Structure 1
Amino acid sequence: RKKMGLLVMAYGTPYKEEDIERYYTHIRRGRKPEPEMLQDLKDRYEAIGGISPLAQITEQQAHNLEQHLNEIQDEITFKAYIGLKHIEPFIEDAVAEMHKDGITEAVSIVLAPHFSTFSVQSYNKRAKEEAEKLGGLTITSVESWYDEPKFVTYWVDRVKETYASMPEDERENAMLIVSAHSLPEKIKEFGDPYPDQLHESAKLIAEGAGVSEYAVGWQSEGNTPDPWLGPDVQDLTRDLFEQKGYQAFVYVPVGFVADHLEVLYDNDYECKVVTDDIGASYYRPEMPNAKPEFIDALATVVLKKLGR
């Protein structure tokens, strides 16, 4: 049994209400949010059911993956380490931990299926530079996994169930909106494949579920310096309805893997407000979270990367 480190990286989420300030200050490059901003951020977390369940998902995903990988093959024993971008344990901390435990070989994976220079590449770079600084630790990094058959099927099956559940009439006038986290539009100057990968994910899911009509949109953009990738899901819904009058909208935020704020609020609240206003039905299938089907897809991605 070869010992290998499994570095699972993610954006990060506060652990308790008192972390919101520092968590958002970090995301905003040092600009701590105004008292008024802080206050409603808390309100949003409360509306969605609370903060603590949020961070648990990432930990559960990492541990279930570890446990699953170690059961499906007999050559390697994986040890999972979580490295986050906006709250401890940060990426550097997780790498330092691995080095401390005597890990010399590691494989990394970001919990976001699509690659981006702004996101994934940045995480991978941080993980590798730290390892390099410490020395004696080598890391092979997965860059994207949106096209993993097992991951595509999870969403294909969820879309099928949803379309099957709606009345024939809504089923006749339904629109599938596939989305991911918006990023500054400037990434395109670097030839960033992020937009293309999202569109490809949308094609993969729609075709597998037999959906002829679907659209791609973005959500959760930032503090507008230069424009961010658009169109936003809120605007896209309005637009699409005024044009063809879709009686139902199914949101598949394929860019996200858990029941986090950007799904529970930006979709379940913000998009629902729009559908409620226009009198259309709102549908948003369950996120993969730590579901066995999902953990199996992640294990396969990691095994393929190592050629096992």
Structure 2
Amino acid sequence: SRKKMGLLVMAYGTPYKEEDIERYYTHIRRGRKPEPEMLQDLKDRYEAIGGISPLAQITEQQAHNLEQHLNEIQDEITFKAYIGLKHIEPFIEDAVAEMHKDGITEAVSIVLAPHFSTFSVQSYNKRAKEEAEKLGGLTITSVESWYDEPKFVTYWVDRVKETYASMPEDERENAMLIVSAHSLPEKIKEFGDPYPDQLHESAKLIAEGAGVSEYAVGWQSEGNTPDPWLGPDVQDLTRDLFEQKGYQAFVYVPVGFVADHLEVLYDNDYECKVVTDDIGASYYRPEMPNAKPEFIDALATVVLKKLGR
């Protein structure tokens, strides 16, 4: 009785094993192989966060759970998930090619990053659509952003509330909430890219929902291209805010990220933690969504809303 649809789930991608680090970072760096010292540093970082293998598993579990939950909560469509990645196989084009091979003619896509940008989301969507056009007989409707889905806001609001509730009384009254996403080159401004505005809006919505009056917006994980990147960086922001007002606790909500990957487990849980430890403040960073039912229901709602269902 049901219509078949592809569910194209897109993400940055992560190495599968240590021996993938070289090719994965070469791809990120646009063909420039990391030097030996950098390769070694990267391996050490992954070791420090508990290893590589669990990383790509999260993305897989998110796609699987999303597929199953979508199929459970409505009776009109049967979805089949395909994963399409930017920096490692299966590439976006591979996923579209497989949908076509499997006889999918209608699909909906979503990127596992809640804010629209020209650099990432728009590029992924365009790439998916271009391959579908090349192959023919398959159309894709694409989710562009989802940071403002109420169920998603509620996820983080509730995690934040729990974190503040857990604090000793003196911290609860002298904390700062830092809401962040992956930095991008400032030059996206030239195109009117709403990415920064959307991060600020995520921050406002989460702080408001949680009843937190003192918060700030920062960026993290900037690449090394010569042109300026969006700032301030969370490490600098933390110290600046401390020097300015003396906060006893910092709560990090990397809302731009959806899982326990290197840019949270290392860029927050290590790099930010260095700074909080140095200044004598308490470090908190509530659970990432990962593949938890609350987050999966949020994504499901996003997809069904995009289809008018």
TM-score of the two chains, using structure 2 as the length reference: 0.99
Structure 2: distance between partners of 1:223 and 1:23: 16
Structure 2: distance between partners of 1:51 and 1:39: 14
Cα shift readout 1:62-119 (whole Å, capped 9, x = no counterpart): 0000000000000000000000000000000000000000000000000000000001
Structure 1: distance between partners of 2:42 and 2:286: 25
**Partner secondary structure for residue 82 of structure 2:** strand
Structure 1: distance between partners of 2:225 and 2:213: 34
Match of 1:198?
199
Structure 1: distance between partners of 2:41 and 2:200: 33
Structure 2: distance between partners of 1:107 and 1:63: 15
**Partner secondary structure for residue 57 of structure 2:** helix
**Partner secondary structure for residue 268 of structure 2:** coil
Match of 2:14?
13
Equivalent runs, 1:124-273 vs 2, <5 Å: 124-273=125-274
Q: Deviation at 1:225?
A: 1.2
**Partner secondary structure for residue 178 of structure 1:** strand
Q: Deviation at 1:201?
A: 0.3
**Partner secondary structure for residue 269 of structure 1:** helix
Cα shift readout 1:7-54 (whole Å, capped 9, x = no counterpart): 000000000000000000000000000011001100000000000000
Cα shift readout 1:160-180 (whole Å, capped 9, x = no counterpart): 000000011010100000000
Cα shift readout 1:199-220 (whole Å, capped 9, x = no counterpart): 0000000000000000000000
Q: Deviation at 1:290?
A: 0.2
Structure 2: distance between partners of 1:73 and 1:165: 37
Structure 2: distance between partners of 1:286 and 1:180: 15
Structure 2: distance between partners of 1:262 and 1:146: 19
Structure 2: distance between partners of 1:193 and 1:301: 19
Structure 1: distance between partners of 2:131 and 2:80: 18
**Partner secondary structure for residue 269 of structure 2:** coil
Structure 2: distance between partners of 1:140 and 1:125: 11
Structure 2: distance between partners of 1:222 and 1:257: 19
Structure 2: distance between partners of 1:69 and 1:29: 36
Structure 1: distance between partners of 2:20 and 2:128: 24
Q: Deviation at 1:244?
A: 0.2
Q: Count residues with an aligned counterpart.
A: 308
Calculate the aligned-residue CA RMSD, in Å.
0.3
Structure 2: distance between partners of 1:275 and 1:294: 29
Structure 2: distance between partners of 1:96 and 1:196: 34
Q: Deviation at 1:301?
A: 0.2
Percent identity, aligned pairs only? 100
Structure 1: distance between partners of 2:137 and 2:209: 44
Structure 2: distance between partners of 1:252 and 1:168: 21
Structure 2: distance between partners of 1:189 and 1:283: 35
Q: Deviation at 1:224?
A: 3.3
**Partner secondary structure for residue 82 of structure 1:** strand
Cα shift readout 1:213-236 (whole Å, capped 9, x = no counterpart): 000000000113110000000000
**Partner secondary structure for residue 294 of structure 1:** helix
Gaps of 5+ in 2: none
Structure 2: distance between partners of 1:83 and 1:58: 10
**Partner secondary structure for residue 176 of structure 1:** strand
Cα shift readout 1:259-278 (whole Å, capped 9, x = no counterpart): 00000000000000000000
**Partner secondary structure for residue 23 of structure 1:** helix
Match of 1:77?
78
